[PDB]
Amino acid sequence: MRECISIHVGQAGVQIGNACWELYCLEHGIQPDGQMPSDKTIGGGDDSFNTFFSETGAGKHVPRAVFVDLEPTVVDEVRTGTYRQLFHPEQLITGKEDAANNYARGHYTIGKEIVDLVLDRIRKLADLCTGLQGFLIFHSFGGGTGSGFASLLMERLSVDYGKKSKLEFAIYPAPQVSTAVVEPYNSILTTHTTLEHSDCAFMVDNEAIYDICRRNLDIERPTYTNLNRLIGQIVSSITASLRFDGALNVDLTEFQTNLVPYPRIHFPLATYAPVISAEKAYHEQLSVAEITNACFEPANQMVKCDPRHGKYMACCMLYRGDVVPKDVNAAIATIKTKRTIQFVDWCPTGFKVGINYQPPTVVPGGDLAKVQRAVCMLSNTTAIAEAWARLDHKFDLMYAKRAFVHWYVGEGMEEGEFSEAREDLAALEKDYEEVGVD
Amino acid sequence: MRECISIHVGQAGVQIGNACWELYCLEHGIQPDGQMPSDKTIGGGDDSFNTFFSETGAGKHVPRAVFVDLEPTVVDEVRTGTYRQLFHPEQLITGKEDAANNYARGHYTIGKEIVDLVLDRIRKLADLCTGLQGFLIFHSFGGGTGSGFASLLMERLSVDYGKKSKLEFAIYPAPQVSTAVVEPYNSILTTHTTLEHSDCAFMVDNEAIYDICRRNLDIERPTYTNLNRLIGQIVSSITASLRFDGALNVDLTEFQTNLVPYPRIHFPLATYAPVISAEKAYHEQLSVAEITNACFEPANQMVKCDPRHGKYMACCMLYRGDVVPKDVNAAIATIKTKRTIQFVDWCPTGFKVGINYQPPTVVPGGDLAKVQRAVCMLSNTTAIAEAWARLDHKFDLMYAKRAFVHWYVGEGMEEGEFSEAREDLAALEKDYEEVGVD
Amino acid sequence: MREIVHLQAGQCGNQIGAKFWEVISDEHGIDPTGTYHGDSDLQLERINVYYNEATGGKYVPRAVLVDLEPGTMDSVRSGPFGQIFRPDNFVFGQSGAGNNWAKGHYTEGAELVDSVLDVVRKEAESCDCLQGFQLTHSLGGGTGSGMGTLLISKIREEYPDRIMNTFSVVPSPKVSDTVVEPYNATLSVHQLVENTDETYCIDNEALYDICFRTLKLTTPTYGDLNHLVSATMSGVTTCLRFPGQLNADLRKLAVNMVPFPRLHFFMPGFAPLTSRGSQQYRALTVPELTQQMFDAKNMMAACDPRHGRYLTVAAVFRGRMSMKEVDEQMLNVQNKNSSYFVEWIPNNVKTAVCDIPPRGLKMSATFIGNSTAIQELFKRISEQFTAMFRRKAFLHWYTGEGMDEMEFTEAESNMNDLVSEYQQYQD
Amino acid sequence: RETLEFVDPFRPYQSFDTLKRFIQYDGKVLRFFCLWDDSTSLFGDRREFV
Amino acid sequence: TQKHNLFTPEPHYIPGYAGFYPQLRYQVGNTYGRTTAQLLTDPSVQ
Ligand SMILES: Nc1nc2c(ncn2[C@@H]2O[C@H](COP(=O)(O)OP(=O)(O)OP(=O)(O)O)[C@@H](O)[C@H]2O)c(=O)[nH]1
Ligand SMILES: Nc1nc2c(ncn2[C@@H]2O[C@H](COP(=O)(O)OP(=O)(O)OP(=O)(O)O)[C@@H](O)[C@H]2O)c(=O)[nH]1
Ligand SMILES: Nc1nc2c(ncn2[C@@H]2O[C@H](COP(=O)(O)OP(=O)(O)OP(=O)(O)O)[C@@H](O)[C@H]2O)c(=O)[nH]1
Fold this sequence. Notes:
part of a larger assembly; 5 chains; A: alpha/beta; 6-stranded parallel β-sheet; 15 helices; 10 strands; E: mainly alpha; 1 helix; globular; binds guanosine-5'-triphosphate; EF-hand domain-containing family member C2 (chain D); cell projection (chains A, B); EC 3.6.5.- (chains A, B)
């Protein structure tokens, strides 16, 4: 049936995946013990959880996700958390050594002896699955262990399974903030390796996530908890179609068909319009018009891109809650009448709507609003090529002065692969204006 | 009727027989005294024990086994144990002198004056028995007392009783671990003596039993108590056909006919699929598919052989518990669809299934799981010859430099018998080859 | 049932035999008077391997004492356990030794060998079936060397069917005190290698080095040295007397350690030795036991086998261990120094694990070594013999006794044959 | 499913024993004194048994 | 040492064991049981 498997590689990607399952157990009302109250939803594992959890005759929900990391500190800590009884011990694949931010160390030195184990997990999860539309991969481009390990496993799952979908989600590197200077080194290594195998990649940047927090959420001092709950809401919204239904039901297969124009570039942008603090939503009203203005207001994007400097290709909107096609179609029509919205002439239509009646729920101990009508806005524009334009002039300098190469060549590589990525990157930009130029 | 006699030779083979009888009384609920409660099961010796125990009008269940040993240390201690009242005193056949690992010392020096005694025991056991399908022999190859004494007695019981089955079970010598350098001496001596008389020799290796313990049982420091329990479960599963019925009932005679293809080679491999920890089985589910995957997973074999380096001839699975033909026949059909498992083209069908309804129970103070569906996997493959291939290149070096020969020629022997066995082995590998050649 | 009768010889054996036996009584908890205080059931089963029964729960040690000088026995008798030894088992002579080996081998032994044979067969008939015998003495010990060579030869044709152990201490290489000692040792070893099968090699200098290393107590008593080696000697005997899944018979052991007949000489090895504060500074783990077990410093027998290679190794572990750690420890050391063994035989290890700890500690062990480290020993004595045989020093005595230089020729030639034999097998 | 509960084999059987009670009450006899009237017949009157 | 015990109050000790049994020197009796019946009956020393 309609189920999937999630992947969370790296200490970066494990705390966020933890929050998602924390959120996911909430709307399903899953108790931290592992079982419901005297009410009956258990069986052969076939209900709203059959797509996410695995609650067999034992009555314990087994989430369909694998957490892999190379350092035991955080994973053992969450192994001592609140839902650890729910979590499968060796689905929480731990490690004893790190990649030291080195792409190839996590790709050559240690990834060999651990991938065989996780493949057993994948196949032993594959057999119990029925339809398994695809995979939910959560990582980070600046992965000290997320980057290198994922590149190894993603091609391994691609070569044996090239018939099903693979969904990619990672933090985009901060355009002007760098907590690591080898991060641009490994990031371009991941991109050029993933471009020919990654199906649909989606990125996000924390700075504007922070910027939103003190703009409208009005929190000048949030924490990761807020960051994880926001993206957890994002993945919840895209997965609500799997959980509930609405006016029309849409699937990732429709998303991949209706978003990516051509091969290579598969990098659209997600956005959630009703990001507002609580105290506001009491005394104002929400409707499709303003949130449509909000989701298309450029400053509400979490990626530092000026859409006026680019051109729109596709726009996929997922209205979760009580909406009607009438105001929807009328409002988006006014958007089409807008002149500043410069779509490419190649797309007469570029709108992909998915309706779900279920209202978005608040989280206990949270800071969000009380949303009845919500949209997660998925779109791809040509204003993104500047981001890679930032990386290459960042990249070309240090490669020319070949910093830290002694580290990389010290444990066994050469610069030719670093050479390949540069025209792999270069081919990306030249393509972007070529498709950008009508 | 459906009964058998068990034989336990070697102070190595004595503790395992104790554990099996310890296990055997639990599913029968036998109290250590020797009698059930006031409930009515005693009689002329006819109930579930009749195939194993001898609970006559005296009301005391007498196991149909013979413990034979030559060092009174362990046998006296177990005679001070818990069920010693159940055990028959001179059925606990003891000796006052050892064989010093020497096969022929245990085959010539002292075995002559004791075999007549045990011969009296077997006939006095034979007369009381009714059908006595065959014998159950626990022994060892590298036996300080297991090797030499068993060889003489199996010669004597074969010539007078050559019309019934004899079931052989010995710990296979560890390939790269050696507790004694004379172990190759007696081991190949035993093999060449047994090949023309032994009916069904089944081998195990402790290393992988240990390897299993910290893979899935997750015990880094187990003991023999666990080791004997694991093999004790194995013999329990094969004997469950005698204890209970099933969807179909299978017997060693069917096992003998359907397993061994051709004379000489009668050396299959056994494997128990649901070996897992209590908590793992607690929040996980067992079904025919994944356990069928597990039993054919190469690392789950207790013998260090790669089936991809060999080819399959016979495969017997003994499903114990609540199972149906539907999933089982479909699963094995999918197994036949698998390409990696390379059966020989000679056998289109090589799958012998024995269904038993009785679920495998847990043991008090044990480490096993709560199994409802279990299978004992008996199979024979050509990947076994590497073991003897390992054996011979160890022997050929050592026989060339004739180490320890003064020990053997000192107490009565020569080199011809040692010479004779090596071409027997050299026959074994060459016989193992053309059968592997299609 | 299979038992052992002990032979006490030499004036060194006078001290070790007392120390060796009192440890056993203390280990089994018998009071000095001899009335057993029932505390341990396993020792309540297995003193019959070594002791017979006296009236009133008294346990006669089945050992025989032999010497010439009465004062040594009187000190032994006036010891803490002289009462538990028998005046029946005290055979001696009416002569002073002067540790002329020939006198004890030809002159003094003749009128005493008859009596000692009578006593031992009386003891031998008192018991049912032996594994065999063991002897405590010194190879360079004058009166002990003279008597044993006679006794070992006599008991050869007597009972050529039993376990024929020998426990001798090597004199100090740096100084032998006795200057005719190299004559005494060379004479004895000629017949020893003919008559013996097992030989323990012990040297005092190494024991002196051990005291400087772990005992660290400046000035010890020779009894403390006797305490160490008696414990090692007791350890190899613990395996017989105690239960647990480990194989006990020395023949179970000897065939595994002895590849060729001429191999009789063996190097002991013992387990944790602890210093001033390390009792409360040590975490007892099989890894650190295994490390300390295979330490050239922990060695005490002859000298460092580092200069050579390892033929056979056998270590018995005493206490609450398991089959897995001993297995992985053997693999670790197997991989640790793979080259330092001989390519003739791999997996040259023979492991036994005694589940019963000693009284006071839980995890202990003992090791017996057969490596290429004995060459320098008889190489050392080779120069001494040749130098002293170069100009027949101190020789008129033995000619007066009735000895001739021809005997000395084959004794060294026998020794020289061993030099090539040990060399040829490894080098 | 009671038919499928009927499809649930357990292999039962039963037998007996007499030794223990024999041993328990070995060498034990009860003794009582009684009377039967025979005067109903015109020949005999009475007789006493134990 | 740190261990457990044996020689539980008779009747025990099936014939066959190897070992000395305290004050076994006055076996005017005949059976293995009767001896052991009295032997453990006599811890009277202290
Ligand atoms: N996904 C994620 N990223 C975070 C989070 N907090 C900070 N980051 C950023 O994500 C990056 C983490 O990547 P890595 O440091 O390479 O993690 P790793 O590959 O598993 O290896 P390590 O260096 O040992 O952590 C950091 O550079 C941070 O800038 C978070 O909560 N989740
Ligand atoms: N069957 C069995 N084997 C064991 C056990 N524990 C260890 N072993 C192995 O089995 C071997 C025993 O063989 P032997 O030593 O010749 O045993 P034996 O012939 O009865 O005579 P002994 O020398 O007294 O033990 C040892 O080398 C161990 O490696 C056990 O509990 N059962
Ligand atoms: N008892 C004893 N013997 C020692 C000691 N130190 C070294 N030895 C040597 O142990 C040797 C063996 O003793 P015996 O065989 O009884 O000596 P012996 O035959 O009586 O004659 P000598 O060797 O000349 O004393 C002696 O030769 C001593 O040199 C010690 O501290 N105590």
